[PDB]
Design a protein around this nucleic acid. Structure first.
Ligand SMILES: Nc1nc2c(ncn2[C@H]2C[C@H](O)[C@@H](COP(=O)(O)OP(=O)(O)OP(=O)(O)O)O2)c(=O)[nH]1
Ligand SMILES: [Ca+2]
Ligand SMILES: [Ca+2]
Ligand SMILES: [Ca+2]
Ligand code: NA
Length: 341
DNA sequence: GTTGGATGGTAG
DNA sequence: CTAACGCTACCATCCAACC
């Protein structure tokens, strides 16, 4: 059993360097503008040049301007990044039809039948990386291991433009010296809870009672960390199914006025009903970001699918609810559909 | 006891 | 307006309704 993992290098920023190569070698920052004021919004991603100076996903655009006033700031063009992603994902299918597309810029391939060993896997990694570069001009990191989770860790250790092959015998070694925070699924919260417990390496999970682990981080994730330490966690490659589709937009000013919020709500419904593309949901939720950036939601499950007309009607009702049940202003407003027929 | 539903969290 | 966009999977916690 051998899985190969691909993750595209500084993707949105790289696509922009492909479309305009006079950008190559200078810092590029791709931005989600929010129209609240001049350069309101956050950074989606930046190339490695920009990153060395602290510019990374999630910081405000104006924070990045204060560090790199002369970097190149381009608006995010999702549609274009998605066409490139699809072309590449189609490319990957020809190397294995057993492919799990995991996000806009990554995918897992089961290559068990395409190669006789890990050294041939490496060679296949080199070919995949070369062809992607030849056809779409985009560099990528490849991580090969015995299973998804280790294939992913392998890729993280190698980025950017790299390839790393942890084979079934080197995996044991990895478990011992992996930082617990470098485990996929362990963020700052979980990673910090675990320090309050002596667990710094992955392997340390095996030397602590199950209950104390389940107590701090819950059942699902405790079982996850333990089974991974024992090297008994071979989760299968499966085609991705969309379970929910939605859209959220940022208002030009905070408000609790229904008429002032509706235009944005309706824009989110229209856009997310288009993204639905013939799917028919039985669940709708209105999500609100509050002035203090907390997130509240209200929703309904119908026994039948929801028409665009029903969505318009019920979403106003759910927004009304939010406004009655919570006293703060709204800063962002959106909808999400789930439970497809 | 299940299990779906409403709502909120963590992560990538 | 004063810094913090958007997307979606999976999990947890409570609940009443169920077979
Ligand atoms: N708008 C937005 N897009 C994001 C955010 N995080 C990631 N993305 C998008 C933009 C990235 O180019 C793309 C892939 O994300 P990655 O996590 O793999 O990082 P990226 O490819 O940019 O750099 P890479 O070399 O891994 O480090 O996903 C975020 O917070 N906001
Ligand atoms: Ca990436
Ligand atoms: Ca990625
Ligand atoms: Ca982590
Ligand atoms: Na061997």
């Amino acid at each position: 059993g051998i899985v190969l993992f691909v993750d595209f290098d500084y993707f949105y920023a790289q696509v922009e360097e492909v479309l305009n190569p006079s950008l190559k070698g200078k810092p590029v920052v791709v931005c989600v503008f929010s129209g609240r004021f001049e350069d309101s919004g956050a950074v989606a991603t930046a190339n490695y040049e920009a990153r060395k100076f602290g510019v990374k996903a999630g910081i405000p655009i104006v924070e990045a301007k204060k560090i790199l006033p002369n970097a190149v700031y381009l608006p995010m063009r999702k549609e274009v990044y998605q066409q490139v992603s699809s072309r590449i994902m189609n490319l990957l299918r020809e190397y294995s039809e057993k492919i799990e597309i995991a996000s806009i810029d990554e995918a897992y391939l089961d290559i068990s039948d395409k190669v006789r060993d890990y050294r041939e896997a490496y060679n296949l990694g080199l070919e995949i990386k070369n062809k992607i570069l030849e056809k779409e001009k985009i560099t990528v990191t490849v991580g090969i291991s015995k299973n998804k989770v280790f294939a992913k860790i392998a890729a993280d250790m190698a980025k950017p433009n790299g390839i790393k092959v942890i084979d079934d015998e080197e995996v044991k070694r990895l478990i011992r010296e992996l930082d617990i925070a470098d485990v996929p699924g362990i963020g700052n919260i979980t990673a910090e809870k675990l320090k309050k417990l002596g667990i710094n390496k992955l392997v340390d999970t095996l030397s602590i009672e199950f209950d104390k682990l389940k107590g701090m981080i819950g059942e699902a994730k405790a079982k996850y960390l333990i089974s991974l330490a024992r090297d008994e966690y071979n989760e299968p490659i499966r085609t991705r199914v969309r379970k929910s589709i939605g859209r959220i937009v940022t208002m030009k000013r905070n408000s609790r006025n229904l008429e002032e919020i509706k235009p944005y709500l309706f824009r989110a419904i229209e856009e997310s009903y288009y993204k639905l593309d013939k799917r028919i949901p039985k669940a709708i939720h209105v999500v609100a970001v509050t002035e203090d950036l907390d997130i509240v939601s209200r929703g309904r499950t119908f026994p039948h699918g929801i028409s665009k007309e029903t969505a318009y009607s019920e979403s106003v009702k759910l927004l009304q609810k939010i406004l009655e049940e919570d006293e703060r202003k709204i800063r962002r407003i959106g909808v999400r559909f789930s439970k497809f027929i």
